[PDB]
């Protein structure tokens, strides 16, 4: 009852006395360690594996025996275990290993539970649950169907280790609606709902009646949408985000942490936003809604009129340059940032990725094309012509679909190019000088917001909270961080920061009399301090 | 506290009805599967592991998860699975991967707790324990220290897929008196007692303590000694056998198994007992200890005088042939097969193999080397010269120890040799007649004996128990097997094999009068229907 209690379970760190006390001496190999040895233990076991989804399998087993230990793990190799606790390696262990997600608590949701999805919560028995991760599987950009639970898994976890979410008050959820994979239809070890994926209105029927039942059952939760496809993750939060306290990380989290990195990234190369020139490599609705942010945040940061700054930008769609005169329908979301000041003939001439950026003289690159390498050599020396700084982020993932190397950038800019990356990569050193690309992580910004939305309890999410997530994120980047080159505070310190970024979007949910919770202090040193109390810690409590 | 409990939980084998009775409506995926889908799904989940060492830790997951489920999936591909769950993966898990045994029940002993070894097993709150296997991790051939305990767990298990030991009624054993094993001594994760072995006087001190805490505390248990080294387990068994209700696998375990596949080698060689020339291939204790429990069974099955018996044998050590004329002073277990036919001249020629079975004309080698593959090809041909159905053994370990592959011995025999082995091997295919060894696996012994001193409660196990085994298991090798060639009955059908061998030992207690349970029947028909009825079966129950 205290060995076989994974929240309470210290294993080698019981000292002899607690032992006897507990009556578990010769339970366990007579060692005594401290959570420090223990971590360091766990970590040379996990390098005895050599593939991420073996050492993820050796994590979830840690997870089962002593979950204190486990986070703290992560927490002191956080850069390391990311990408084995969630992106790419949570994919991949969902696809072809769906089995290590099969101990972990989950709510799982479909249409034979139509009218009983309140009864299921209450059923599940938790306290005052904080976070839920909802996914259907579906996939931001592999079909995993039921399977998607593990994304769930993955990114409640992540909540915890980031922003001290109590690990008893955060609920992984699948809606399972069908799934599209035709392996998985046909496999006899799938274990989801065996059909294609229900149409609009049954898949609202059963999302409305999730999202009443949670808002009933599970109060003070805040709901996250993780990893839903594109038909429908826009048309989800357009349904819910005035009516219920919920977001979308893919869509909301990563123009937050693009935006805070971009406008440090500004700052480095002395060309002010006003001066920027910003190509945008890829013109699909979330690039777009990136963009938007960058606006969004120089206008909070700075009192530039939106408008203004609307006009650095210069989208790019698979037919070249958006203008006003190229003489197509212009998608309703590219209609915003199309140049009304390039002419029919110009239009004609600006199809090619080398052809724009010799007309436009970007200073900016902004790789969300999704598509190869397209920030050619040629394209980032065009670039140094118009700027002393130039700044490129090759943001798309996977790495093979990122638009140049951040030691390419650095190579070829002889150290000058200011990067962010969707992804890590290693330091890369030029004339005896280092550079290392800024990772914008979405850990930087989802956890703090679901702590801030924890504690401040608003009615809903407004972009208002997500904005000054974004702008809180950017002002944690010191005069240090910045004179190293650093476009963020660093992965390492996520507790800090996310206690500063829930710290100001509580003070936002406040300014706007959204906030429930009368409990929390209303000026920001005094509520820093409480929101650091406030979260969990992975340290042997009692 | 049903899906968490490994014992009652089902997992996907919850039907619709029982979720919702239950209140887990929702925390399973949809599909309701019964146990034989559920370990047909389980079999590919292990498939799609390449390594063993890999193959064992998503079996560990499952005995975590749903321990019916993991037994079931033992028992529906036993063979395939033996050599992930015991020797020789247990041991490369025990020496590398130690992290695997973690999470299981176990008692870990050593000097720090001397005087308190029996408020150690009250406080571990086990009810009526039926079997203990303890270990020092000396082992009986890469000195393991406290991670034996991984090999005290693995061989509780095969006791409970075995015999139906009831998995709550088994406690594996590590006795930790140090580790000889320098990389250990150095390794900063070691979590044993970090100092070389105890001299005998304390390691005698500490094991008598063990053993007289267990009969008072675990009354009802068998004691199994394993893998322990060759300076111990002999001195153990001479120690304990008498007051305590114990035995040694390696030593008495492999001697019954051998034996009963022995003379069911003869039966089928037509070369009756008492016309076999046997060569014993290595002159160790166990060596002689396996030739004597030979000459014990037919001595016991067909009433020859032993000494008639004890002639058959030529005993072959590291110096040639074993002879009284020879000129050493032979060590005290050689003097019993040692030739007194040989002259002093004959025995100086009698060193090489080959020279040895040139001058003796055997009908049988027996391997027991522990050497390289000295069974050869010219070693066999004259084999074939003494007999039309040569009985060749190689029963050392690993498979590269071994004197000879059983395909090489059907080739060279064209199909007229009859072969056991100690591991498993694939058929072999001459002119269109498939052969395939049998292999001596001790899992036909220990479990049956296991089951029977846990209903019988003998006040001891003597050696008449072991030989009664040795019978039993020759006796369920049908006329229809033997016609095919086995020498044993199927391992698949170790449940009926272990209840077979359980009552013929319950029965011989009752004759010597030891037994102390008085509810058995004492007639061998109703007392089998009564032993299969008390094993524990890995089917969902309630
Ligand atoms: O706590 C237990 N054992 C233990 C823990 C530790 S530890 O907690 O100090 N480290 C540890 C843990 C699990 C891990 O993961 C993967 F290997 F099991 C990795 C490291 C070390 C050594 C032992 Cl024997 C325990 C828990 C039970 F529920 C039942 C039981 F029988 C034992
Ligand atoms: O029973 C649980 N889940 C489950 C079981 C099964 S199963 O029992 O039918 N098969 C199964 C099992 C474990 C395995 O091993 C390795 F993968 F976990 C392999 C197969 C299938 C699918 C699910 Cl979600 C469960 C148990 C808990 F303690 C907590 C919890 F949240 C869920």
Redesign the pocket.
Known sequence: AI??D?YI?????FTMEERQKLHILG???PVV?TLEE?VA??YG?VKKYEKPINRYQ?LV??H???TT?YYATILAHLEEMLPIIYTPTVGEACMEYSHLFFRERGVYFNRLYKGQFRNIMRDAGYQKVEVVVITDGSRILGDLGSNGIGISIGKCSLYVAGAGIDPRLIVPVILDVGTNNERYLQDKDYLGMREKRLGDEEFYELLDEFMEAASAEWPNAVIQFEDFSNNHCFDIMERYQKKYRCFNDDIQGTGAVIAAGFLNAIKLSGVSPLQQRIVVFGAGSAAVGVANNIAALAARMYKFPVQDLVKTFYLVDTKGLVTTTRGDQLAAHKKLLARTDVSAEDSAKLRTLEEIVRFVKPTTLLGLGGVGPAFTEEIVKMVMQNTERPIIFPLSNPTSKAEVTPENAYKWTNGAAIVASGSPFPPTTIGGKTFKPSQGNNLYVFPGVGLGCALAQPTHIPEELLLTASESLNLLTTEGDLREGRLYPPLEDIHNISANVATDVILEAQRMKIDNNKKLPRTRDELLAFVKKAMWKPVYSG
């Open positions: 060995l076989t994974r379970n210290r294993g080698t760190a339970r366990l190999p360690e223990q233990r766990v076991q050796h087993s840690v089962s025996t002593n230990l």
